[PDB]
Amino acid sequence: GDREQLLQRARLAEQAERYDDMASAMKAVTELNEPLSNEDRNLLSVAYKNVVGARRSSWRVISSIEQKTMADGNEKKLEKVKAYREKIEKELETVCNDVLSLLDKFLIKNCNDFQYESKVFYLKMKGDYYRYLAEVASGEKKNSVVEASEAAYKEAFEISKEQMQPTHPIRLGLALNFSVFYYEIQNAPEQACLLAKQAFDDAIAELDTDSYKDSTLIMQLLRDNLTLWT
Amino acid sequence: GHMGDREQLLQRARLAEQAERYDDMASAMKAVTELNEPLSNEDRNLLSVAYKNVVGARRSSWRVISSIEQKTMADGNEKKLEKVKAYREKIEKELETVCNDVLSLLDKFLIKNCNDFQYESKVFYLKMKGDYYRYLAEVASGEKKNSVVEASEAAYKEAFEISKEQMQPTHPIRLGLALNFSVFYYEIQNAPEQACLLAKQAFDDAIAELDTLNEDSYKDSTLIMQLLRDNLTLWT
Amino acid sequence: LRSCSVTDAPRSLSSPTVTLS
């Protein structure tokens, strides 16, 4: 047991693009009950985003094949497509539940009242993984994670508005994802368009401010989504 | 019927391919092979595509970590080099299991059941046998490397003899076999001259007969031939 | 579709095994 050895394994796994190893290593680092630095937060976020992203992409492909099979009326094939979709789905939920458990027990819990940057980062992360759960759920099960997603996002947004500049990349990313939540997950395009437009306009008004590349790309993404949502 | 082992496993493999979940795809195709029935051309392609992606991810990860093992060895950090080599060995063991799984399937089912008149299947499987022994040779050392190097060459040699006597020079399987076998000479045996002769001969034999091919066969043959050409340029 | 969310941050050539799917 050694924190530095785990972080090295996380970095080695990332270079080899073995993100399950990288997520497992950063899961153990978080479980040491010691705070995560900015680099540590990046390694944890990168690892699990890649792990869940592979499940999300695989789920979307199989889900669309499931619908096409359903329309064609092929009941025998549909049962086999659904079995694979459910198998992929449970992996996705396990990944999200692992991240949410890490956040609710180690990361968010151990934040001080003055560690605003970490608190915004973790609360946004909590909204993201509840949103990923909401993507594959329906009915009362969806509403449960949808409500949890919105609650995490809003507390993060309120803290970021009070403590972060409008061109802070963390605040911009949170606004981007929070607007995505309103549009895709809960079918509120006007609410999504209003929020994306607020953050983009607020960022332009203070565009006279070293981390430009990180902030600039998210700003383009905010405009791109606004163009798509018209 | 549709509930049979073969039908369900093939359906799983096709779905796994769509989802780019190649570990699932290879495991499903491994189970299809173990049914001891011959593989169609499509099934053969699914098995080959699945394991190419599975071993290829491990090879790419191995080379990245092995490259760091070289720099960390030259830099001289024992506290770091020991853990780096441990991570690579974990990747190697995954890689060797995958290759051994393939070679077991070829030795016990695929090559075994080929009838003597199934020249296409034999060339395909023998080339695959040479391919996965070569992937073992890429990571092996000592006396272990010698045995897999000899095994790879022997599989390639028998495949190439059959392909020359049974397949036209423009056949993609023969062209792909010649390409991989010349790569074996250059990369594994460190024999550039032998590699260049094999690739050049294969390119020359094929290009003499491209003009008879139809549009679709032309695209399949020239795509492998371009790889032979690119290898020749890089080898001198 | 597919709204965008916040992003995160020679050897010899052998034969490609193209799929027929």
Residue numbers in the entry:
A (entry chain BA): 4 to 212, 216 to 236
B (entry chain AA): 1 to 236
C (entry chain C): 338 to 346, 444 to 455
Copy text from the publication.
Because the 14-3-3 binding motifs pSer342 and pSer448 border the WW2 domain, we assessed whether this domain participates in 14-3-3 binding by crystallizing the Nedd4-2335–455 construct in a complex with 14-3-3ηΔC. The phosphorylation site Thr367 was mutated to Ala to prepare Nedd4-2335–455 phosphorylated only at Ser342 and Ser448 for high-affinity binding and for homogeneous crystallization. The 14-3-3 ηΔC:Nedd4-2335–455 complex crystallized in the monoclinic space group C121, with one Nedd4-2 molecule bound to the 14-3-3ηΔC dimer in the asymmetric unit. Although the structure revealed simultaneous binding to both phosphorylated motifs by a 14-3-3η dimer, no electron density was found for the 97 residues between the phosphorylated motifs (Val347-Arg443), thus indicating that this region, including the WW2 domain, remains flexible when bound to 14-3-3. The recognition of the phosphate group and contacts with the 14-3-3 ligand binding grooves are similar to those observed in the structures of the individual motifs. Other contacts were not detected in the crystal structures of short phosphopeptides, including the 14-3-3 residue Asn43 from the α3 helix of both protomers, which interacts with the main chain of the Nedd4-2 residues Ala346, Val452, Thr453 and Ser455, and the polar contacts between the 14-3-3 residue Glu15 from the α1 helix and the Nedd4-2 residues Thr453 and Ser455. A similar contacts have been previously observed in the structures of the Nth1:14-3-3 and caspase-2:14-3-3 complexes (PDB ID: 5N6N32 and 6SAD33, respectively). Concurrently, our crystallographic analysis of the phosphorylated Nedd4-2335–455 bound to 14-3-3η confirmed the bidentate interaction with the 14-3-3 dimer through both 14-3-3 binding motifs, pSer342 and pSer448, also showing that the complex establishes more contacts than the structures of the isolated singly phosphorylated motifs. Furthermore, in a complex with 14-3-3, the WW4 domain of Nedd4-2 is located near the surface of the 14-3-3η dimer, whereas WW1 and WW2 are fully exposed to the solvent.
